Design a protein around this ligand. Structure first.
Ligand SMILES: [Ca+2]
Ligand SMILES: [Ca+2]
Ligand SMILES: [Ca+2]
Length: 147
């Protein structure tokens, strides 16, 4: 995910709003209702996809990480360069200023995106034009913009 401070507290607030059980979780059936409560607006099919999935993958309750996770993929609708730089620091395991195939999978797995060293390697080559096997704030911004 890559939500700012205000954004995080925004959906996080609307998240606790639908948690009377005190389980820090929100019913997947209330997901669509929560979206309406938020500036979001997922397509009918979309809601039916994530809800049905979480219905047999999370019993009947959803987690902050679950909701946020989606909100993240949804927020991607904005290719703002700002949110990219922030994601650059988070992704880049090191402070050198570059990302390597190793660091790529390491992060993708942290977020929740299951990927192999093969598929991710190609993704790097796509954003890597200088051909060096490393990513810079520029090559990163581009590949994540399409994410
Ligand atoms: Ca709950
Ligand atoms: Ca690094
Ligand atoms: Ca490069």
């Amino acid at each position: 995910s890559e939500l700012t401070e205000e954004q995080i507290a925004e959906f996080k607030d609307a998240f606790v709003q639908f948690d009377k059980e005190g389980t820090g979780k929100i019913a997947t059936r209330e997901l669509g209702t929560l979206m309406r409560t938020l500036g979001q607006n997922p397509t009918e099919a979309e809601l039916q996809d994530l809800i049905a999935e979480a219905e047999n993958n999370n019993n009947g309750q959803l987690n902050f990480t679950e909701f946020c996770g989606i909100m993240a993929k949804q927020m991607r609708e904005t290719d703002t360069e700002e949110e990219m730089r922030e994601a650059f620091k988070i992704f880049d395991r090191d402070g050198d200023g570059f990302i390597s195939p190793a660091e790529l999978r390491f992060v993708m797995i942290n977020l929740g995106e299951k990927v192999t060293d093969e598929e991710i390697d190609e993704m790097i080559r796509e954003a890597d034009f200088d051909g060096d096997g490393m990513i810079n704030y520029e090559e990163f911004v581009w590949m994540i913009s399409q994410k």
